Amino acid sequence: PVIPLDPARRPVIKAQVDTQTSHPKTIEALLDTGADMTVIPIALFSSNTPLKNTSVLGAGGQTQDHFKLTSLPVLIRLPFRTTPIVLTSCLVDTKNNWAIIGRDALQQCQGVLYLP
Amino acid sequence: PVIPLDPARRPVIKAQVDTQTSHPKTIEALLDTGADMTVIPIALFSSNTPLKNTSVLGAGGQTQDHFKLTSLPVLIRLPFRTTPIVLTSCLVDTKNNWAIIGRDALQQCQGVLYLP
Numbered sequence: 001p002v003i004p005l006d007p008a009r010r011p012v013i014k015a016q017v018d019t020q021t022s023h024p025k026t027i028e029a030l031l032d033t034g035a036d037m038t039v040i041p042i043a044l045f046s047s048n049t050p051l052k053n054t055s056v057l058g059a060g061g062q063t064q065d066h067f068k069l070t071s072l073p074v075l076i077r078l079p080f081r082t083t084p085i086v087l088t089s090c091l092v093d094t095k096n097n098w099a100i101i102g103r104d105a106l107q108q109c110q111g112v113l114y115l116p
Numbered sequence: 117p118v119i120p121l122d123p124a125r126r127p128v129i130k131a132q133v134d135t136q137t138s139h140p141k142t143i144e145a146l147l148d149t150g151a152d153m154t155v156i157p158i159a160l161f162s163s164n165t166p167l168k169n170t171s172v173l174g175a176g177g178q179t180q181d182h183f184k185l186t187s188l189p190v191l192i193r194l195p196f197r198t199t200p201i202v203l204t205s206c207l208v209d210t211k212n213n214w215a216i217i218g219r220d221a222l223q224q225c226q227g228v229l230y231l232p
């Protein structure tokens with residue numbers, strides 16, 4: 001679908017996320033062309049799930065803390081799609097619970113940005 | 117133009133920014149559907165320009181020293197376009213000199229996100 005861009009209304013979407021550690025869950029995620037990589041909430045995971053450490057570039061510079069990588073791929077299903085997005089790895093937000101569909105996922109559903 | 121979304125290649129654009137505090141300059145800016153507001157480098161301004169202090173949520177926790185608000189509106193022109201995007205106010209990166217075109221600007225050029 002064509003998704004209008006509005007400063008007052010974030011372009012969010014329902015996404016079923018399978019972290020392969022528990023049952024697939026539906027979240028509301030921000031469609032973010034400015035994001036190199038997808039971010040999912042730590043709440044999607046179980047308590048015994050191992051994650052890799054990392055340091056990501058953010059608005060406050062380097063955040064050497066609340067972002068981790070999954071060891072296993074992450075599967076994401078959009079409402080109008082049966083076939084899933086399969087990310088080799090993606091970021092996990094451990095402080096807050098940000099949900100961000102990055103260009104890694106957007107490429108897989110062949111999404112484009114269009115300026116008239 | 118149609119801009120493909122690619123985790124390895126950021127959707128950037130060359131945009132002429134008029135801060136109305138110095139001569140208009142062309143910068144490279146990230147096209148970002150996840151940004152509520154536009155960010156421009158403080159380099160485009162003069163040393164005597166008054167700016168407002170504020171608080172902006174970003175990846176690296178929560179910052180309130182990084183970004184400032186403009187006092188005057190900002191005009192942005194896209195390639196081969198004479199009629200300017202007019203932003204009443206936008207963020208000013210006083211540190212890493214980021215250039216981000218948010219949904220405030222993307223709305224005025226009628227930009228859309230398209231998922232096939």
Ligand SMILES: CC(C)(C)NC(=O)[C@@H]1CN(Cc2cccnc2)CCN1C[C@@H](O)C[C@@H](Cc1ccccc1)C(=O)N[C@H]1c2ccccc2C[C@H]1O
Nearest residue numbers: 034035036037058146148150151152153155174175214215
């Ligand atoms: C993979 C990861 C997500 C960590 N990457 C980023 O953070 C990139 C980095 N570049 C770095 C970069 C900068 C310049 C050139 N190349 C790379 C700048 C662009 N961001 C993506 C941002 O668009 C992320 C969003 C996320 C968000 C939205 C709403 C609420 C919380 C978090 C974001 O930061 N948006 C905020 C935001 C951001 C800018 C301006 C205003 C606002 C308001 C707010 O919406």
